[PDB]
Enzyme design. Sequence first.
Site, PDB file in Angstrom:
ATOM      1  N   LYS A 180     -49.110  11.455  24.006  1.00 41.77           N
ATOM      2  CA  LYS A 180     -50.449  11.020  23.640  1.00 41.77           C
ATOM      3  C   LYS A 180     -51.127  10.413  24.857  1.00 41.77           C
ATOM      4  O   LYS A 180     -50.471   9.841  25.731  1.00 41.77           O
ATOM      5  CB  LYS A 180     -50.423  10.006  22.491  1.00 41.77           C
ATOM      6  CG  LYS A 180     -51.670  10.029  21.630  1.00 41.77           C
ATOM      7  CD  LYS A 180     -51.679  11.248  20.727  1.00 41.77           C
ATOM      8  CE  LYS A 180     -53.074  11.537  20.213  1.00 41.77           C
ATOM      9  NZ  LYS A 180     -53.066  12.575  19.147  1.00 41.77           N
ATOM     10  N   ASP A 189     -58.999  15.590  21.063  1.00 43.93           N
ATOM     11  CA  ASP A 189     -58.828  14.574  20.030  1.00 43.93           C
ATOM     12  C   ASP A 189     -60.169  13.931  19.697  1.00 43.93           C
ATOM     13  O   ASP A 189     -61.222  14.512  19.976  1.00 43.93           O
ATOM     14  CB  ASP A 189     -57.811  13.519  20.467  1.00 43.93           C
ATOM     15  CG  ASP A 189     -57.095  12.882  19.293  1.00 43.93           C
ATOM     16  OD1 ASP A 189     -57.539  13.083  18.143  1.00 43.93           O
ATOM     17  OD2 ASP A 189     -56.087  12.184  19.517  1.00 43.93           O
TER      18      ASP A 189
HETATM   19  N1  LIG Z   1     -52.668  17.297  15.676  1.00 42.38           N
HETATM   20  C1  LIG Z   1     -52.796  16.022  16.372  1.00 42.38           C
HETATM   21  C2  LIG Z   1     -53.614  16.192  17.655  1.00 42.38           C
HETATM   22  C3  LIG Z   1     -52.802  16.665  18.850  1.00 42.38           C
HETATM   23  C4  LIG Z   1     -52.891  18.165  19.060  1.00 42.38           C
HETATM   24  O1  LIG Z   1     -53.562  18.841  18.253  1.00 42.38           O
HETATM   25  O2  LIG Z   1     -52.291  18.667  20.033  1.00 42.38           O
HETATM   26  C5  LIG Z   1     -53.439  14.969  15.476  1.00 42.38           C
HETATM   27  O3  LIG Z   1     -54.533  15.217  14.970  1.00 42.38           O
HETATM   28  O4  LIG Z   1     -52.840  13.910  15.290  1.00 42.38           O
END
Ligand SMILES: N[C@@H](CCC(=O)O)C(=O)O
Length: 416
Positions: free
Chosen positions: A102, A142
């Site tokens: 992250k 994000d």
């Molecule tokens: N799917 C993740 C975001 C990171 C990504 O898609 O690589 C989330 O919304 O928490």
Amino acid sequence: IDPFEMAVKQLERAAQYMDISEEALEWLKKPMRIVEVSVPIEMDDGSVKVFTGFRVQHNWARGPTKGGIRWHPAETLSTVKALATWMTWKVAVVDLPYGGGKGGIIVNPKELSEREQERLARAYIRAVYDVIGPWTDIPAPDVYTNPKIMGWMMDEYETIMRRKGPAFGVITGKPLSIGGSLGRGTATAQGAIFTIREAAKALGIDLKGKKIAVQGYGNAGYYTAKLAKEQLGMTVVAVSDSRGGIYNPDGLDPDEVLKWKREHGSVKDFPGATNITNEELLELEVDVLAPAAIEEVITEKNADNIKAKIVAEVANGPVTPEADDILREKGILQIPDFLCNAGGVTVSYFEWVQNINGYYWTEEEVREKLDKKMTKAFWEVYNTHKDKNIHMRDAAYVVAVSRVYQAMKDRGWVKK
Ligand SMILES: N[C@@H](CCC(=O)O)C(=O)O
């Protein structure tokens, strides 16, 4: 409440339901690498402002870490760590060769111009180049971040990297012109629809002509409703945005609802529908309910009155753990939040594979592969749920932690 401590408590609760050594749990309770860097940019007035950037890599036993970058004025190092920990389990439950990662920058992007945003992205890449790469750490879009920033970041990484490898694969969510992937706009909705279909198959329910209710009418909610109506042949009876909500017995047309919302700024006053609230939507008697909006909408206050038979947690943690227990007691099949919306990370993995291989797929191939991955993950989670007689969220946590623990043991990191 501190997010990292909540994540650690969640991990401990998951470990309570499975056989894991204490050393492995202690290893999993700490991010393996945390990077905090200063991000200086030149403002339009000529002054230089320094921002705080984060890059947490929780675990990379299963492969390169994956996770988005947040640009929020209220960003903290603890939120990054908690979201990286969550991303580890998210990529583990859907069986991807990925770790948890992250990133984030403490900045208000609404007050930054386009040139300042580009400078911020390029400076962040210049700061965190030493800990990212196609096989080390793959960022993603994000909150308050879009494919445009992804393209800028990829360009900066390629400039620094002197084109010595697959610089396209260093970051996902890129525009289709530069290493982009098809079906990246409806990834979450497609995954949610596949999980709903698998849940209906497991419960022995024919969805043809059934009723669905969607809370939240943004990107995920609108596309989920549209895909349900099209692919599942179900009847979308009610939707709701942040402003209000509408309800229709026969059924509404999601495209018309979106057009009305664009025209008037809200889904309220829609013809042929009665204006209702989010709450009235929550206790609406439907076979499938998909909350795709602000988190924690189902609490102990309204858990017992939920008439939904399938609750697809498209949003991030929309159900309270006590509400989870109440829903499980009533016999309502729930889908864990980090399993239902795993389509986005799966499509990001597909984009990374296409960038790495240099060969790009079509919409049909991406949809079929996403269907396969979501179906297999949901069936594994449901089988664990039935075998261990634990909650669906607990079963998904057990599956993800078991995969990560096995990967750690195979590497020799933990001897027990
Ligand atoms: N799917 C993740 C975001 C990171 C990504 O898609 O690589 C989330 O919304 O928490």
